[PDB]
Amino acid sequence: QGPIEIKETFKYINTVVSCLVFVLGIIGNSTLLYIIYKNKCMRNGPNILIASLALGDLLHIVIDIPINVYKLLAEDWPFGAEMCKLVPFIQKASVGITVLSLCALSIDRYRAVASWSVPKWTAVEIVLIWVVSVVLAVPEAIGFDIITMDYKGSYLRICLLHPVQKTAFMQFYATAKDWWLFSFYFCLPLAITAFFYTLMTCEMLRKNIFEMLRIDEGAEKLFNQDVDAAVRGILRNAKLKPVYDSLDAVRRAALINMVFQMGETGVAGFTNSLRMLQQKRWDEAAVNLAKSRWYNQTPNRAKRVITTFRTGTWDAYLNDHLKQRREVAKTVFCLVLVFALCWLPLHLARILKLTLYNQNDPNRCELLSFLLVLDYIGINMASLNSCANPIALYLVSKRFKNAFKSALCC
Ligand SMILES: Cc1cc(C)cc(C(=O)N(C)[C@H](Cc2ccc(-c3ccccc3)cc2)C(=O)N[C@@H](Cc2c[nH]c3ccccc23)C(=O)O)c1
Ligand SMILES: CCCCCCCC/C=C\CCCCCCCC(=O)OC[C@H](O)CO
Ligand SMILES: CCCCCCCC/C=C\CCCCCCCC(=O)OC[C@H](O)CO
Ligand SMILES: CCCCCCCC/C=C\CCCCCCCC(=O)OC[C@H](O)CO
Ligand SMILES: CCCCCCCC/C=C\CCCCCCCC(=O)OC[C@H](O)CO
Ligand SMILES: CCCCCCCC/C=C\CCCCCCCC(=O)OC[C@H](O)CO
């Protein structure tokens, strides 16, 4: 049958995945804690939050993974009542540390670019993350216990959190647990990190346009309302509106740059160049713009604007301080994205089972086999997330990649 065939297959798959996560995660997160400790240049707010997150994932890896490997392979629980109050507690405490750290990471990225304006603040965050994650994981250590069954010369030890619990709170917890796990440990971080991501990019966008105009125009705080009025007029002009809509945020700022210098009527005169921008022919747009009277009178500014068009980034206008903040923000929301994709299949599987289990035998069989396969994939991706950040940091962050190579290769 599907259920017995599927569980046997994933006995092999999960054992290899969990052995991979154990080895990769022990090496990766230990090295991650090493490079943040040894490299004094690496000690900053976001990195220290990444360190606690790596310590939390290391705790789950060394405490829970070897047991979870055996648990999957044997029907009996031999590790005692203590280990099975501990393993689910560590599992929810560690994931909670990741969940709250990721939220603190995304809020810190917003505050970094925030218009309103702190080393002690990261220390308060660290305490709050671990205290709150551990408190919210305590009901796991409360509800879970061993059930021993003996019938006809055969005994079995299962550790479970029974749907029926002693106290009112533990009863409510056991019943609400599945939705609680979905809400706080998936919906809460994804919503908060997305909310502060979008606010951050908007604020980073204004800071970049402001910096661009500061370099090109050359002490005016009216730049922001001036920009807003400028895009209003660009949306007013039938010659400038179509190309402006086609452009991304960065190239729209390059168009605004030309509008600041020449006005809307002057920018409209580049009908051929504007068309080619709308066609997304950046290099052709760069060349035709380069052979212009605007280029001739102001080549330095023309060079930067046409490079901004062609490139689509802020390279020509971004200072060292702002290039630092974009790489850090890119690192933070890479980990956020990695968390979402790793925890998406499992939370999807649990919610589909929670919502679509009609208990009719005909519909159940095929839906069960699919949901079971999805659940197994889900817990594999979640295990991978506990070892994925060292690899992710290596690939997405030039600083982390160099720190890893210094610590490991030579
Ligand atoms: C928030 C949350 C939500 C859901 C739906 C499941 C888990 C969970 O707890 N899982 C997915 C573990 C395995 C695991 C735990 C933590 C990480 C982790 C930690 C830090 C950073 C990133 C990832 C990765 C995998 C799991 O296998 N849970 C089992 C229950 C279970 C496994 N071993 C046990 C021992 C005793 C009692 C229960 C268990 C299940 O949900 O099916 C956690
Ligand atoms: C690196 C950021 C700090 C992350 C950890 C904060 C929470 C520690 C409390 C319980 C953990 C129990 C497991 C033991 C781990 C020991 C961690 C530790 O001793 O760190 C003290 C201090 O940061 C060294 O200078
Ligand atoms: C940064 C900080 C983030 C912290 C985020 C935490 C949010 C969820 C925490 C607690 C909700 C608890 C809900 C409690 C409902 C229990 C039901 C109940 O109390 O049952 C009655 C019983 O008689 C009484 O003991
Ligand atoms: C500072 C604030 C931080 C954020 C704090 C709030 C985060 C989300 C908390 C609770 C929502 C999920 C609670 C789950 C309640 C489920 C109710 C229930 O028992 O439903 C059983 C249902 O019948 C089975 O299908
Ligand atoms: C296996 C995982 C592979 C993952 C590969 C990741 C590569 C991304 C790197 C940099 C782009 C950063 C983009 C950040 C986008 C914002 C993330 C976010 O806010 O997530 C909200 C959540 O999706 C609710 O909708
Ligand atoms: C088995 C392990 C499970 C995890 C598997 C991998 C998880 C995340 C991997 C990649 C995320 C995106 C990395 C690629 C980002 C592309 C942009 C980039 O690399 O730019 C920075 C670079 O240093 C130039 O300066």
Residue numbers in the entry: 91 to 207, 214 to 303, 1002 to 1111, 311 to 403
Copy the relevant paper text:
Here, we present the crystal structure of the ETB receptor in complex with IRL2500. To facilitate crystallization, we replaced the third intracellular loop (ICL3) of the receptor with minimal T4 Lysozyme25 (ETB-Y4-mT4L). The IRL2500-bound structure is similar to the bosentan-bound structure, rather than the ET-1-bound structure (R.M.S.D. values for Cα atoms = 1.34 and 1.95 Å, respectively), reflecting the inactive conformation. The carboxylate group of the tryptophan moiety in IRL2500 forms salt bridges with R3436.55 (superscripts indicate Ballesteros–Weinstein numbers). The tryptophan side chain of IRL2500 forms a hydrogen bond with the carbonyl group of the N1582.61 side chain and a cation–π interaction with the K1612.64 side chain, The tryptophan also forms extensive van der Waals interactions with V1773.28, P1783.29, and F2404.64. Moreover, the dimethylbenzoyl and biphenyl groups of IRL2500 sandwich the W3366.48 side chain, tightly preventing its inward rotation.
The activation of the ETA receptor leads to potent and long-lasting vasoconstriction, whereas that of the ETB receptor induces nitric oxide-mediated vasorelaxation. IRL2500 is a peptide-mimetic ETR antagonist developed based on the partial region of ET-119, not on bosentan.
